[PDB]
Ligand binder design. Sequence first.
Ligand SMILES: Nc1ncnc2c1ncn2[C@@H]1O[C@H](COP(=O)(O)OP(=O)(O)O)[C@@H](O)[C@H]1O
Ligand SMILES: Nc1ncnc2c1ncn2[C@@H]1O[C@H](COP(=O)(O)OP(=O)(O)O)[C@@H](O)[C@H]1O
Ligand SMILES: Nc1ncnc2c1ncn2[C@@H]1O[C@H](COP(=O)(O)OP(=O)(O)O)[C@@H](O)[C@H]1O
Ligand SMILES: Cc1ncc(Cc2csc(CCOP(=O)(O)OP(=O)(O)O)c2C)c(N)n1
Ligand SMILES: Cc1ncc(Cc2csc(CCOP(=O)(O)OP(=O)(O)O)c2C)c(N)n1
Ligand SMILES: Cc1ncc(Cc2csc(CCOP(=O)(O)OP(=O)(O)O)c2C)c(N)n1
Ligand SMILES: [Mg+2]
Ligand SMILES: [Mg+2]
Ligand SMILES: [Mg+2]
Lengths: 547, 547, 547
Amino acid sequence: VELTDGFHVLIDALKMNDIDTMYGVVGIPITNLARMWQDDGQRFYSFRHEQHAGYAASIAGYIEGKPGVCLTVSAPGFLNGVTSLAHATTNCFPMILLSGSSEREIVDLQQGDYEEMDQMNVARPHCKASFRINSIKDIPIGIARAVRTAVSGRPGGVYVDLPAKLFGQTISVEEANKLLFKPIDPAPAQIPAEDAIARAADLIKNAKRPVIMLGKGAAYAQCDDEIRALVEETGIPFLPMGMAKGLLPDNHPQSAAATRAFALAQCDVCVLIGARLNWLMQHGKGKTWGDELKKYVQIDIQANEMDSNQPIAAPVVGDIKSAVSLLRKALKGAPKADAEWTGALKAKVDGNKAKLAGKMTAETPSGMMNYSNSLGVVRDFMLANPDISLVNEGANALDNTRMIVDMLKPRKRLDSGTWGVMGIGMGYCVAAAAVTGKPVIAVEGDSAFGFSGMELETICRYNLPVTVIIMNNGGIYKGNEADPQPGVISCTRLTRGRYDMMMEAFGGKGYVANTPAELKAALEEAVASGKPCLINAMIDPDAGVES
Amino acid sequence: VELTDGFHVLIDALKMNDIDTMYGVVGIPITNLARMWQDDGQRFYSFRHEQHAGYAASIAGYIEGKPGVCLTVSAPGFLNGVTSLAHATTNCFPMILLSGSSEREIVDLQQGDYEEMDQMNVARPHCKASFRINSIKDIPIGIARAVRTAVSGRPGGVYVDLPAKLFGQTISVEEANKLLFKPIDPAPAQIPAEDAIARAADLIKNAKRPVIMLGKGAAYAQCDDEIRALVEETGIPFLPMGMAKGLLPDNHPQSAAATRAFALAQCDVCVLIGARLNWLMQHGKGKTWGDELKKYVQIDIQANEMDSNQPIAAPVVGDIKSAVSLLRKALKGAPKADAEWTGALKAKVDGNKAKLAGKMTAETPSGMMNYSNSLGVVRDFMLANPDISLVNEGANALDNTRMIVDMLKPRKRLDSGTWGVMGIGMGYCVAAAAVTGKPVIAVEGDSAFGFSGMELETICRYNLPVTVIIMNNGGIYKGNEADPQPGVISCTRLTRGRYDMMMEAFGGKGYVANTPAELKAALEEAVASGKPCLINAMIDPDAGVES
Amino acid sequence: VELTDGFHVLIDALKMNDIDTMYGVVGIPITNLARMWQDDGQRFYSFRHEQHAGYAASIAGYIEGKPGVCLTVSAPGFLNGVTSLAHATTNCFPMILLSGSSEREIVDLQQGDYEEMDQMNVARPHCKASFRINSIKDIPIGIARAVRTAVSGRPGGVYVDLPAKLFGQTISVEEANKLLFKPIDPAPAQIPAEDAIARAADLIKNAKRPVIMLGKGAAYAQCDDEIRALVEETGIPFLPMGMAKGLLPDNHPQSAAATRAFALAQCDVCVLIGARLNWLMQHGKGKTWGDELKKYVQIDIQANEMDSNQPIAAPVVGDIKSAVSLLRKALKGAPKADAEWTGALKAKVDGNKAKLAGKMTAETPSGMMNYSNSLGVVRDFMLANPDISLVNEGANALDNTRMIVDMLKPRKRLDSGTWGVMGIGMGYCVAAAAVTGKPVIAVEGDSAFGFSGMELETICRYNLPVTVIIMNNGGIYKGNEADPQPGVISCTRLTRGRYDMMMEAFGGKGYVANTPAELKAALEEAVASGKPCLINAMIDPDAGVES
Ligand SMILES: Nc1ncnc2c1ncn2[C@@H]1O[C@H](COP(=O)(O)OP(=O)(O)O)[C@@H](O)[C@H]1O
Ligand SMILES: Nc1ncnc2c1ncn2[C@@H]1O[C@H](COP(=O)(O)OP(=O)(O)O)[C@@H](O)[C@H]1O
Ligand SMILES: Nc1ncnc2c1ncn2[C@@H]1O[C@H](COP(=O)(O)OP(=O)(O)O)[C@@H](O)[C@H]1O
Ligand SMILES: Cc1ncc(Cc2csc(CCOP(=O)(O)OP(=O)(O)O)c2C)c(N)n1
Ligand SMILES: Cc1ncc(Cc2csc(CCOP(=O)(O)OP(=O)(O)O)c2C)c(N)n1
Ligand SMILES: Cc1ncc(Cc2csc(CCOP(=O)(O)OP(=O)(O)O)c2C)c(N)n1
Ligand SMILES: [Mg+2]
Ligand SMILES: [Mg+2]
Ligand SMILES: [Mg+2]
């Protein structure tokens, strides 16, 4: 009677759930899992820190709509990875953190085992569900639970604890076959009732100055044609959130993005589609919303997200595709949004875009570029070459890139997210490049970048087509804050370093861009090469604002 | 009537408790605390990731015996820091993590605040106590509690939550000066009963083959002369744990370190001074202890550490200085350890040191050094220059450096610790340099180094006298593992990179060392320069072992 | 080769740690543990709800100074018991909650096992340490850890999770003998340094108007002669906290209890001995302390209790016996406290006691007694018969009994404690009677009593010499609050019921007392009988105050 072991049953269970990639860092007790994963023909990305392996898993989950999988070791390794897990859960990104753990007997009596921690219990606040698979016969069920919990309802992070003793357990191949199974429909459709849709339809029809807010929940739903048909048929102005950019092209004629404050402040009805009324929307109150209570339509899969901040007139609970599909039929043949309202917002968009175009064309000293004329180059490149992932984080480097770099394609812009995390950059680059098989451009603030900068070597080792643009202004916000005391450097200062040399240290290609023309020629060559590159864009230290 | 604010009451409260240094990363809502700390004339070290600012804080606590203070932002920055607090708590290092947090009203209803998290609750498993100062009037009491919890009993990490709204509250200077106070005797002496000492004296006096195990709790106590006087007066051979190296000079004639296996297996009485019978001691059982229950004497400030793993025949609960002083007087004038026991171990030690000296002088090809002849250079240098901090982490780079590099001075060796953390290196380097005012050498595994390597820029930015030695063997354990499939790199491989170039990129000095002679010249020149350096030591990819 | 099993190894380990009593409620999976405990000759008290079995365990711990042991079942049973555990931890009472739990495999995958819960993790905030014993070979060590954690440092609650699969495991009797052991010195003495004692001695010597506050930490320490010698030699007025009553007799001439507010408000030095500066001491501020900062001496075993509320001038950290013993020698031959100060407080005590004596002698209608003339009877009885435990809880029934019923003997008064728990009554009665083997009187508020009233049957079933006096005023605070609406009873009303009938329902003796003479004759007969009794004392519904 032939046997298989815990390593292989786990490998098999994972593949049966359509996982072919893991991002992690090896060591006791999980190194042979990673090796056997690779021997079997599946792929494993080894990082330099588990946090970044974890941010990679998280964004692979957003892009693909199946859980990104992170593999770590016990205690300190697990902790690093659980920080990324927390991030996924907050952003609604499906992810599974697999971590090796130590001996139950010793850990439960707190005796001081190798890398001792109840990792299952410390994971709890940072994930939807935290499980432990103790027995080889329970791996198929455990992985099914983890995948279902990650992708169903509101997607998010799940932790699966893999005690060291799990892997060496044996069981007959005949029994293993009998236990291995594929979950039916792990991310089911959830459809709203007629009267929920009808209440929303009547709000929108009687709106005088409506608006549609698209969030990354809408972008994640992968129903781009449905969402676009709703916008185009209703005639309603729309606004995308940071990662909702590209769902409809950012230069779509119904986009009120360039006149956002005016549109939010002046609307009567606001349709939230896969967008929370959280801090990124000023909680639906204050000066951004005209100091009044709007009448909201909200489409979300989480029922208790409704009324979380402001009362919602028309709550529609269900998956966005189902809900939008039904709303479109309820609104069929109704009048389009008021020409006076839509034309007024278009006039503000054109006037604001002309104002921005002047900034981008302006001239600056060599090596002292500003955020406008530097990011104008990236904008032009991205309009001509839209099938490229855009990774973005920082302060001035984020806000200006979101404003300037138009996305024409959905789920391409990958940014700091709901928590404004600095640290997501290089991990996002590795994952985006692994799952798309297409180029990646990153626009990194120099402070932002240093949270994950050592992963430059990971990008080189896997020869990925990623181009990292460092907005090297020499600091957090600004690069010129005076010494507080004689001989003491200010806390916001960073070395205006040769990040291009760092990239070349690990086999990558380095550029220094002192002018827009130099940034353009470097970017065009980098992306064309298909090789790991870094462009050190030299930005005026005083160009940024703090706020 | 004149007023002060939360910022300054916190600065004054910290200063009153003898804090003059913080390690952190700035941003909302805590940047202006960092600035005013510097304005007032105290020092702030800005890092590239909060985890490494936290590892610095942790080892500053070990070295000085007063809490290392780390300052982070809310949610994601807090999470990064709290991973280091965990480490502090596990290693018994006094540390305070100060983090800004968001708005109470919004976080408590989970509405989606900027960087939303119950950071106070999330910290609880990773610290001794988790507090929050909500009001200006409680800052001095709050900081007093933090410093007492951190340094008293078993020392460890404390989290203090600093809601954004705390800093802008105002109070009169006269009221604030009445509230501000310095705690009396925050880490008190705790003296054991006479019969506790008598029970231990009895076991030692009747031992045939006694051994003293010194742990890093003994080193932390800073009573090096007392511990040395106990060892010399009794004539008992001793064994240092990883960071107890140098407490007594590693070349002391009574050291049994080079014959640890034999000494532990054959002893009858084992005297634990500030050392746990945890995984680093194989839990007081198995082959390493000759498959028998030794008679244990244990000195520890934590009462319930006794009988955690094995029954302790002579528990002595109290601070190590107090206990050792009493034990010495209790053993005064008694005969020394058996000369055939201490002679047997000395013969083993000399024979084992002879075998290692043979390896350290062996010859290897250019760019293909092994761990003996490369680290033999570091050994010779540290014998000549002992007033230098030795930071160390990795697998082969750790085990071989702990074995080969003799520490003649206490609290100089700073390594991975109880959790075997990869990531402590560059943070430890910064704190060590800061608190000692003297040179630091780091012997880093190349995998190890990648967990904090971006902090090279921090080391350069503060112009610290730190020399980083990368044991560049091309991977985890080894750098030569075959491609598991055509064109697919193995998971344990790293780029054999130019880490020297990376250092040069931020204004440091980079060296490549292909031979022991090149490593020696470069190490001597680097330490003597007083400047940030990195030596890329080229190790044979097949040199290291795995299991 | 002869075998033993998990049940017996646990029984043996428990007895070796000097436990002979358990309080609990049986059922799956722990009923045979309770039976075998009894078969072996040890005693088991079965309650009607685990909470009250738990309050019994907690107070057995206070009285004896070794952990009270509660035995419960999984999920809902455990939860009930953990509520008592939390109470023990808050009051610093040594206690161990043993709970059966379900199958690891099923619970860790949250599949819906019988009584599913991670009881080890939900215990965490309510105890000092929460452990789980998975393996038969680890029971001796697990029980040692639990006992050491309960009684060492600051005493408190420990949870030990006993998975169902533990009990049926086998091991050789030869190996069981080898693993069973008795912890050496689980509650060690901890002695303070000379200079800590000397700083306190100098504060007390230079005090103009000193005072000693004795708390239940001092009463728990069982060093009654030491504490009394300190008071009598220094000549310092003293004040006892609720359960510190009787440590010195309440009518001791140096007691300033009857003039408490004046003494706290007018002192310059305050010596806290085993007493926290918490809500029961108004946090050392406000009108009770003259709106000024006192200079404090505090003796406590928990080092970080110091400066928790107010700055402490003379912190003495150590066990009370050790600390008081040393302080007494430092103060030897020094002048006694000022006659003008001690005589002034005595004059207020006498005048206040005369004022109280008039209230107690006053006449009331039959069936409408007040708190003074009713509790005056209990007072007289307790002076004549002091070797009786006094259990007490309620609002008016607590405050008036603490004021009126003088305790002449230590650790006899057992009350609501730090949390002001209603619910501790009948459990306290069962435990007090089990551990003392002497009579118990309970003074219960009628609302208070109903939290544990069904345990009257437990008291009868074990034929315990307990007399429950219900202060039957017909409500919470007052028994006469008008109906808020027509036909609706007010929320503070209770049925003025025949609690004497309820007692007789289970074989006990019932009395109704309508007058002081009737209460006196019933109490004298009840206590003389040595049988379970209840006196239904009919109190005027309008006699109480709410505040
Ligand atoms: N397929 C889906 N159907 C419905 N709602 C979804 C779906 N996927 C995600 N969501 C919801 O979308 C929301 C995403 O909001 P958020 O992350 O704040 O986006 P943004 O920051 O772009 O506004 C979440 O509330 C989540 O529950
Ligand atoms: N001042 C002190 N006096 C006595 N014991 C101490 C003191 N400081 C720390 N300890 C104890 O020392 C121990 C440290 O042991 P550990 O971290 O395992 O060292 P190692 O890993 O070197 O064996 C802890 O159990 C801690 O309670
Ligand atoms: N043997 C002991 N030695 C020193 N301190 C003790 C001892 N036992 C208990 N304590 C301390 O006594 C205190 C009890 O305070 P508390 O329960 O508030 O008493 P009270 O309510 O009567 O003031 C706790 O802080 C506890 O740490
Ligand atoms: C994990 C974490 N730690 C700190 C912070 C706080 C922060 C917000 S923005 C920022 C850096 C801004 O500087 P950058 O150079 O990137 O951008 P620029 O203005 O163009 O110069 C930090 C540190 C966050 N958000 N997350
Ligand atoms: C936070 C964390 N993540 C992973 C790990 C697991 C590990 C233990 S040792 C090691 C690296 C070994 O390679 P290195 O190059 O440093 O040493 P060597 O080539 O043999 O000289 C890892 C990743 C740990 N301990 N902590
Ligand atoms: C577990 C719990 N739940 C509620 C409460 C709140 C409370 C405080 S006092 C009290 C009852 C007071 O009435 P009683 O009849 O006992 O006394 P008297 O004035 O003489 O009529 C309650 C319910 C507490 N403390 N604990
Ligand atoms: Mg910057
Ligand atoms: Mg290596
Ligand atoms: Mg009542």
